[PDB]
Amino acid sequence: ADRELDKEGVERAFSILEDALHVPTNPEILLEKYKNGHRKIPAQTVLFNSLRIWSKYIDYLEAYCPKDANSSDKIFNKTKMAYNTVIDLRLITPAMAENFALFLQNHYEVMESFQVYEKTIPLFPPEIQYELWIEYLEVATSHQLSSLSPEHIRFLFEKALKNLCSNGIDCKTIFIAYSVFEERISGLISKSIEILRRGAVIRLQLWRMCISKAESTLGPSVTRELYQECIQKAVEFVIKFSDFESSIGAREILAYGAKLLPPSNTELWDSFEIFELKHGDKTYKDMLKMKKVLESNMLIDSASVS
Amino acid sequence: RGGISYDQLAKLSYEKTLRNLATQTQNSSKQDKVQKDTKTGKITIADDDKLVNKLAVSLQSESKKRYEARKRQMQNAKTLYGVESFINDKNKQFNEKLSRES
Amino acid sequence: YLIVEESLNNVEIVRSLYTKWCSLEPGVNAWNSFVDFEIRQKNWNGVREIYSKYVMAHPQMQTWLKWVRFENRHGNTEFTRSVYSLAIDTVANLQNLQIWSDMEVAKLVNSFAHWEAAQQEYERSSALYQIAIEKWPSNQLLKAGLLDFEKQFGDINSIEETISYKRKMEYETILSNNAYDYDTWWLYLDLISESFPKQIMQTFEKAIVDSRKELSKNVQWKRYIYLWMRYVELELENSLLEEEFQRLIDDIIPHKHFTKIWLMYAKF
């Protein structure tokens, strides 16, 4: 192929490489009879299976198609059937599945590139679907030609988000993409229960903390519910987050310092928390010294237990 | 997990013998009736003398392999463990059984 | 008995043995080794006779879908849709016996449709979803498996038509479960105002303002108000404003007939 591409046209380079890729009647039987055949059956018959053959065939097509193809052209109809044949042969790698969906979005075939993500995710195992769902959900919300309804974009998240956390992946971004887009198209703070689910799946502390900042902008009635639910090493970090929420909107915070120190070992960071709560006031270094006195006595009790 | 039931293990050992029979036909390729009696109800089947020898030798050879694999497993079983005190082989054999129960 | 007669290459004795053994209805291990026997012997017409009997001995989709995995392995298109036509009629013919579950019939409808999508006939892929949902309105899995077919092979207005229904059922089942989640109301109404406009569109707005006391609640009524107002309006406005208003009635009398309805709603 490579010597003929320089000497002769790419149409000559296709035609010598078209003869490689005849998918005859049945690839399932020929693939199996080749694998079970002990070196007697030639690989001339099962030559279509080879990924290397398809990728450099396609890369000639995707290079030869013009920058404006718009589906009238023969070649854009030719590279799409050659791309779809790879998916039907099922020998498509996930970087190659992105190269076809990217291929359609440059040539304004955006609404058919959502079919491209749709066909392939089923075929792949998770830990790889997470990289396709980023590129699929981002085209749905960011690309300008995609006019999808806000109940259709919400379908694409909560079909993925439910499916993808079911097999078990951290899913930090998809939660945020379903969190960020909710203001740009809908514009209400339903964001919290959409993002609470990140904190309570069945990193996670870094999803819980940024949003409990966000409802202190909107309204304190839905902050204080999170401050309760935030606390129910990692446990100690959750207690610290609760103390910060109390400072934003003090006795509940000090008692929380007790609840957190009693949550777990070391507790000096909690001392920094109560000290922060004391420092926040613009009252008497009496309750503070009493607090350090109570903490020290608790430490002495822990030493007695040990 | 679990053990394998006697229906599945009969099937799996059936498939292993078919694969082994398939490779014997493959190797034989690379290296190159029913009459019922009138007098009685007895039935007669014409057979080649080969493939009866080949079945009998295969059944003997599989018995040899399983015998020597168990015999070598006997050798490992009485050479591995020596921690607990015992009296005979049957003691260590029974106290391996108690270790299997844990 | 089999692997000895296999070893002797007596192919007519294992065939006579298997015909007897599959007559006593033993289980799926026997039949699957009997369809694997004829693949060895290349008897393609004989193994097709077995699956005719194998679906009658074990009526279940993993025996029917095994027979379509046989036919799609060989690529014979005339034989595969004949099996597909026999599989979906027998579910319809034997509906009252109740031996295939809702998740079980969804595997047959989807594997019929995704095969017809690969056979480039999208109008047969599309129409069978309608007959299956009507033929079975009970199973949600066949309705939900209808949607994923449109996502892959359908044109965009058809997906949005079907998407609007699944969102309708899922918003309906949360609000029946969860009592006062006011943020799902403000989308469920806007689900029906956007894509469902009809008698239902007015009706839910009644059914919402039924559910409407919080600060979190009452602004939903404000939405239903203008939703009514954009399109009576005074009559429902007085009924809701009755929550309590002596200053309001004195404010009402001075600027109801004098100035508008928008002035009337300003009091509320």
PDB file of N, CA and C in Angstrom, chain B residues 7-8 11 14 17-18 21 33-34 45-48 51-52 55, chain C residues 2-4 6-10 13 18 29 32-33 36-37 40:
ATOM      1  N   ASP B   7     -23.262 -34.139  36.918  1.00  0.00           N
ATOM      2  CA  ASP B   7     -23.755 -33.957  35.563  1.00  0.00           C
ATOM      3  C   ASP B   7     -22.810 -33.081  34.758  1.00  0.00           C
ATOM      4  N   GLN B   8     -22.287 -32.025  35.379  1.00  0.00           N
ATOM      5  CA  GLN B   8     -21.344 -31.159  34.687  1.00  0.00           C
ATOM      6  C   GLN B   8     -20.002 -31.841  34.501  1.00  0.00           C
ATOM      7  N   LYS B  11     -20.088 -34.082  31.796  1.00  0.00           N
ATOM      8  CA  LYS B  11     -20.059 -33.353  30.535  1.00  0.00           C
ATOM      9  C   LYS B  11     -18.661 -32.853  30.215  1.00  0.00           C
ATOM     10  N   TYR B  14     -16.550 -35.597  29.234  1.00  0.00           N
ATOM     11  CA  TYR B  14     -16.959 -35.988  27.891  1.00  0.00           C
ATOM     12  C   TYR B  14     -16.309 -35.103  26.846  1.00  0.00           C
ATOM     13  N   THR B  17     -12.526 -35.832  26.374  1.00  0.00           N
ATOM     14  CA  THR B  17     -12.302 -37.011  25.557  1.00  0.00           C
ATOM     15  C   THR B  17     -12.661 -36.779  24.100  1.00  0.00           C
ATOM     16  N   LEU B  18     -13.564 -35.844  23.802  1.00  0.00           N
ATOM     17  CA  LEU B  18     -13.824 -35.538  22.401  1.00  0.00           C
ATOM     18  C   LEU B  18     -12.689 -34.736  21.792  1.00  0.00           C
ATOM     19  N   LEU B  21      -9.917 -37.063  21.222  1.00  0.00           N
ATOM     20  CA  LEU B  21     -10.230 -37.890  20.067  1.00  0.00           C
ATOM     21  C   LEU B  21     -10.095 -37.092  18.780  1.00  0.00           C
ATOM     22  N   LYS B  33     -21.090 -51.020  10.165  1.00  0.00           N
ATOM     23  CA  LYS B  33     -22.287 -51.699   9.688  1.00  0.00           C
ATOM     24  C   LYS B  33     -23.017 -52.439  10.797  1.00  0.00           C
ATOM     25  N   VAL B  34     -24.251 -52.840  10.503  1.00  0.00           N
ATOM     26  CA  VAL B  34     -25.126 -53.522  11.449  1.00  0.00           C
ATOM     27  C   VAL B  34     -25.817 -54.659  10.711  1.00  0.00           C
ATOM     28  N   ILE B  45     -22.045 -56.316  14.578  1.00  0.00           N
ATOM     29  CA  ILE B  45     -21.519 -55.043  14.104  1.00  0.00           C
ATOM     30  C   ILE B  45     -20.119 -55.293  13.580  1.00  0.00           C
ATOM     31  N   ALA B  46     -19.891 -54.954  12.319  1.00  0.00           N
ATOM     32  CA  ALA B  46     -18.554 -55.057  11.759  1.00  0.00           C
ATOM     33  C   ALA B  46     -17.694 -53.921  12.287  1.00  0.00           C
ATOM     34  N   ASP B  47     -16.512 -54.258  12.782  1.00  0.00           N
ATOM     35  CA  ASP B  47     -15.566 -53.266  13.262  1.00  0.00           C
ATOM     36  C   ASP B  47     -14.209 -53.508  12.629  1.00  0.00           C
ATOM     37  N   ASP B  48     -13.463 -52.428  12.453  1.00  0.00           N
ATOM     38  CA  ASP B  48     -12.043 -52.553  12.186  1.00  0.00           C
ATOM     39  C   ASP B  48     -11.309 -52.998  13.447  1.00  0.00           C
ATOM     40  N   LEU B  51      -8.877 -48.951  16.121  1.00  0.00           N
ATOM     41  CA  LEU B  51      -9.837 -48.118  16.860  1.00  0.00           C
ATOM     42  C   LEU B  51     -10.501 -48.874  18.006  1.00  0.00           C
ATOM     43  N   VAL B  52     -10.332 -50.189  18.050  1.00  0.00           N
ATOM     44  CA  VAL B  52     -10.629 -50.984  19.223  1.00  0.00           C
ATOM     45  C   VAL B  52      -9.379 -51.173  20.061  1.00  0.00           C
ATOM     46  N   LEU B  55      -8.802 -47.563  21.349  1.00  0.00           N
ATOM     47  CA  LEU B  55      -9.586 -47.251  22.537  1.00  0.00           C
ATOM     48  C   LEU B  55      -9.033 -47.953  23.767  1.00  0.00           C
TER      49      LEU B  55
ATOM     50  N   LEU C   2     -21.424 -43.095  24.512  1.00  0.00           N
ATOM     51  CA  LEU C   2     -21.188 -42.218  23.372  1.00  0.00           C
ATOM     52  C   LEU C   2     -19.719 -42.199  22.974  1.00  0.00           C
ATOM     53  N   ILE C   3     -18.825 -41.923  23.929  1.00  0.00           N
ATOM     54  CA  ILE C   3     -17.414 -41.725  23.603  1.00  0.00           C
ATOM     55  C   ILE C   3     -16.690 -43.015  23.272  1.00  0.00           C
ATOM     56  N   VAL C   4     -17.294 -44.165  23.552  1.00  0.00           N
ATOM     57  CA  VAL C   4     -16.763 -45.413  23.028  1.00  0.00           C
ATOM     58  C   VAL C   4     -17.159 -45.583  21.574  1.00  0.00           C
ATOM     59  N   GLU C   6     -18.042 -43.083  19.693  1.00  0.00           N
ATOM     60  CA  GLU C   6     -17.240 -42.051  19.041  1.00  0.00           C
ATOM     61  C   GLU C   6     -15.854 -42.573  18.701  1.00  0.00           C
ATOM     62  N   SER C   7     -15.249 -43.330  19.620  1.00  0.00           N
ATOM     63  CA  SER C   7     -13.896 -43.834  19.417  1.00  0.00           C
ATOM     64  C   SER C   7     -13.840 -44.897  18.330  1.00  0.00           C
ATOM     65  N   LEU C   8     -14.951 -45.579  18.073  1.00  0.00           N
ATOM     66  CA  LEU C   8     -15.009 -46.590  17.032  1.00  0.00           C
ATOM     67  C   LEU C   8     -15.492 -46.043  15.700  1.00  0.00           C
ATOM     68  N   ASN C   9     -15.776 -44.734  15.631  1.00  0.00           N
ATOM     69  CA  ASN C   9     -16.306 -44.045  14.446  1.00  0.00           C
ATOM     70  C   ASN C   9     -17.610 -44.671  13.957  1.00  0.00           C
ATOM     71  N   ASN C  10     -18.432 -45.129  14.900  1.00  0.00           N
ATOM     72  CA  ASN C  10     -19.776 -45.608  14.593  1.00  0.00           C
ATOM     73  C   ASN C  10     -20.736 -44.438  14.762  1.00  0.00           C
ATOM     74  N   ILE C  13     -24.541 -45.175  15.452  1.00  0.00           N
ATOM     75  CA  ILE C  13     -24.936 -45.746  16.734  1.00  0.00           C
ATOM     76  C   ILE C  13     -25.053 -44.666  17.805  1.00  0.00           C
ATOM     77  N   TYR C  18     -28.514 -41.057  20.947  1.00  0.00           N
ATOM     78  CA  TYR C  18     -28.945 -39.683  21.198  1.00  0.00           C
ATOM     79  C   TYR C  18     -30.420 -39.466  20.900  1.00  0.00           C
ATOM     80  N   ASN C  29     -27.868 -30.533  29.200  1.00  0.00           N
ATOM     81  CA  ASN C  29     -26.519 -31.006  28.911  1.00  0.00           C
ATOM     82  C   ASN C  29     -26.519 -32.047  27.800  1.00  0.00           C
ATOM     83  N   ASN C  32     -27.358 -30.159  24.224  1.00  0.00           N
ATOM     84  CA  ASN C  32     -26.262 -29.307  23.781  1.00  0.00           C
ATOM     85  C   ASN C  32     -25.065 -30.122  23.328  1.00  0.00           C
ATOM     86  N   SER C  33     -24.885 -31.317  23.880  1.00  0.00           N
ATOM     87  CA  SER C  33     -23.888 -32.233  23.351  1.00  0.00           C
ATOM     88  C   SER C  33     -24.383 -32.961  22.111  1.00  0.00           C
ATOM     89  N   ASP C  36     -23.879 -30.369  19.372  1.00  0.00           N
ATOM     90  CA  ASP C  36     -22.450 -30.329  19.093  1.00  0.00           C
ATOM     91  C   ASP C  36     -21.979 -31.574  18.366  1.00  0.00           C
ATOM     92  N   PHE C  37     -22.732 -32.668  18.453  1.00  0.00           N
ATOM     93  CA  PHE C  37     -22.364 -33.872  17.723  1.00  0.00           C
ATOM     94  C   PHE C  37     -22.581 -33.712  16.224  1.00  0.00           C
ATOM     95  N   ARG C  40     -19.992 -31.636  14.351  1.00  0.00           N
ATOM     96  CA  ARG C  40     -18.820 -32.495  14.029  1.00  0.00           C
ATOM     97  C   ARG C  40     -19.089 -33.247  12.719  1.00  0.00           C
TER      98      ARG C  40
END
